[PDB]
């Protein structure tokens, strides 16, 4: 258990595609390895671990890791990425099976999954609730993974990056970004700007 | 089987001395304190292998620890600096048993030098575009927690008394309402989508819930506005045709 490194702090992959997260270690004693995942809200959760037995360790949520002594490696794979897998993953190493022994962790690998958008129809809509006030809100939505948003060039106009949602009972997914300003001179027909697709509806 | 930590968020002035409490009911010999920081993984500050017994980890500079009963591992920061702003994670384990480490859920510590200029979020909710309902037959409501600091909110959606995950997306990082301002406030957006009928039925109840973690009872407030304690600020709406 001396050190651990995780080459690649960020991995994005399409839903359905192969997931692979590097972990490599140095140890002057026989190593005990672990993979942990950390989901948005929750604390560290053990995915799998290598004790001095099986070389190919099956973990939870369809994950697997091969311990390779020859290369000082313990890479985490799953052949088919799922949206639920988005998360940060951490390789760790110990000198003993004894819980006694301290874990030294890698730097972490952020996993991002890109949704396969079956039937895209990009639209920029407006929504002005009449409840409180300042209702000046523009939803860019139903667009395709390939498309990207750049944060606004004007200071009074707030824009959030794209976000993926899942309406599980219709097996339907959608990307959305949001735009807004208290500026009376602000309109949704031009709230968003960069690399916007010709067929966008209004 | 629960390692529990004092609290989950915390706001503290540069120079203050700070007590982080980690407790466990499991009768464990070993307790560890790590900090976690975007890009540097988890780094061990201090550990302890029995009552009264401590040891430096890889990064103890600036920290001191206290193991005083078997169950509790308090972490002390002598003089809170902005770069002790971190997620602090406690863990516990048994020497004999094979189950390894159990982790607490964490505590996020933000140190700022400011007249505790922490603000609770204001929360606005935005009814669906009529356009979307006609073109897509789905309806996206949007929520907006605005005017908060530090970055300490947990935004959930509630329908007819039950919290709902299916249909939601919240930004993972908030945006600076004023990027230039060193200790600027943040905003954060979330979206909730359902079928059009579910929205064009006035029996259906739609609330945006936002939990803010600011000040506790120990902290002192004299300013001429409500004390920005840990609270929940919400907005609501109903189905409609």
Numbering used by the authors:
A (entry chain A): 0 to 201
B (entry chain B): 2 to 242
Sentences copied from the publication:
The key molecular interface that enables T-cells to sense these threats is mediated by the clonally expressed T cell receptor (TCR) that classically distinguishes between self and foreign peptides. The TCR governs T-cell specificity by discriminating between self and foreign peptides presented by MHC molecules. One key feature that is likely to facilitate this level of cross-reactivity is flexibility within the TCR complementarity-determining region loops (CDR loops) that form the antigen contact zone. The finger-like CDR loops of the TCR are thought to meld around specific pMHCs, sampling the peptide cargo, and enabling T-cell triggering by ligands with sufficient affinity/dwell-time.
We generated 12 structures of the F11 TCR, that recognizes a peptide from the influenza hemagglutinin protein (PKYVKQNTLKLAT) presented by HLA-DR*0101 (DR1-PKY), between 1.58 and 1.89 Å resolutions; 5 structures of the DR1-PKY specific HA1.7 TCR, between 2.31 and 2.98 Å resolution; and five structures of the 003 TCR, that recognizes an HIV-GAG-derived peptide (SLYNTVATL) presented by HLA-A*0201 (A2-SLY), between 1.26 and 1.37 Å resolution. For the HA1.7 TCR, we observed a larger shift in potential positions for the Cα backbone of the CDR3α loop, differing by up to 5 Å. In both cases, these shifts were comparable to loop movements reported in several other studies in which the unbound and pMHC-bound TCRs were compared. In contrast, the HA1.7 TCR structures, in which a large loop movement was observed, were solved at 2.5 Å average resolution. However, there was clear density supporting both conformations in the HA1.7 TCR structures. Similarly, the HA1.7 TCR CDR3α loop was free from crystal lattice contacts and shifted between structures. However, several other loops in both the F11 and HA1.7 TCR structures were also free from crystal lattice contacts and did not shift between structures. However, we observed several CDR loop re-organizations between structures for the HA1.7 and F11 TCRs, while all structures of the 003 TCR were identical at the level of the Cα backbone. Thus, we conclude that these loop movements represent real differences in the conformation of the CDR loops of the HA1.7 and F11 TCRs due to the intrinsic flexibility of these regions. Although this analysis is an approximation and should be treated as such, the average maximal loop motion was slightly less (6.4 Å) for the 003 TCR compared to F11 (8.7 Å) and HA1.7 (9.0 Å), consistent with the structural data demonstrating greater rigidity in the 003 TCR.
